[PDB]
Write a protein that binds this ligand. Sequence first.
Ligand SMILES: C[S@@+](CC[C@H](N)C(=O)[O-])C[C@H]1O[C@@H](n2cnc3c(N)ncnc32)[C@H](O)[C@@H]1O
Ligand SMILES: O=[N+]([O-])c1cc(O)c(O)c([N+](=O)[O-])c1
Ligand SMILES: [Mg+2]
Length: 213
Amino acid sequence: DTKEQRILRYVQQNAKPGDPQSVLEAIDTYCTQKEWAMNVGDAKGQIMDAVIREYSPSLVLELGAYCGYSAVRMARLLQPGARLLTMEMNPDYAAITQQMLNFAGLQDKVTILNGASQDLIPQLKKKYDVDTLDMVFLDHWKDRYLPDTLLLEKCGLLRKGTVLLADNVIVPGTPDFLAYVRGSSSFECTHYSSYLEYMKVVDGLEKAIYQGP
Ligand SMILES: C[S@@+](CC[C@H](N)C(=O)[O-])C[C@H]1O[C@@H](n2cnc3c(N)ncnc32)[C@H](O)[C@@H]1O
Ligand SMILES: O=[N+]([O-])c1cc(O)c(O)c([N+](=O)[O-])c1
Ligand SMILES: [Mg+2]
């Protein structure tokens, strides 16, 4: 099996069905202790929670679902009637995300869009009944943040007050995106400093005592 199947299995065997907080904790525990994985993680996740609670978005777009950690993190805080749309181009990952959402009981709040954001964004208004977005979470391949921001703007999906929230602007880094939005009068920016998750990296010394030939 894959790492992603192992994460899901761990959740199924250890988390409480229908309990999003339990699902999050199980993922964080497994990736902290057993296998590193590229979920946003609990430290930055707490910052996401605070931002979502401040703006109470009715319509959120996520770029990059992976195993569904951030989709569970965000969707659990949405008010009744609110929606998360999440784009994922890897169908194996999208399958895990759907199962993760099902297990957490959030499947009615979240819709998975299968495909590449650059192909899907222009289809949003028509196929998913979108006027403008209230919030966007960017966490896909880092070279796509700036071109997808420009594409969102072109497609008329941003309104005054739409909140973009971008992961990894330091590590691995998103230098073009970060320079662009900080420099542009079309964006007012705030930085929330944190730490990359799952960085308790096990290593060790081997002692090898020569016994002779
Ligand atoms: C860092 S992981 C997402 C982690 C997730 N946001 C979380 O915190 O649980 C990055 C994901 O973006 C997907 N991806 C990369 N480029 C993409 C694109 N252009 N459109 C859609 N998905 C993309 C990758 O397949 C991968 O699953
Ligand atoms: O390599 N990493 O540490 C990361 C961390 C992350 O949080 C990522 O989103 C990532 N990625 O999308 O490729 C990679
Ligand atoms: Mg990330």
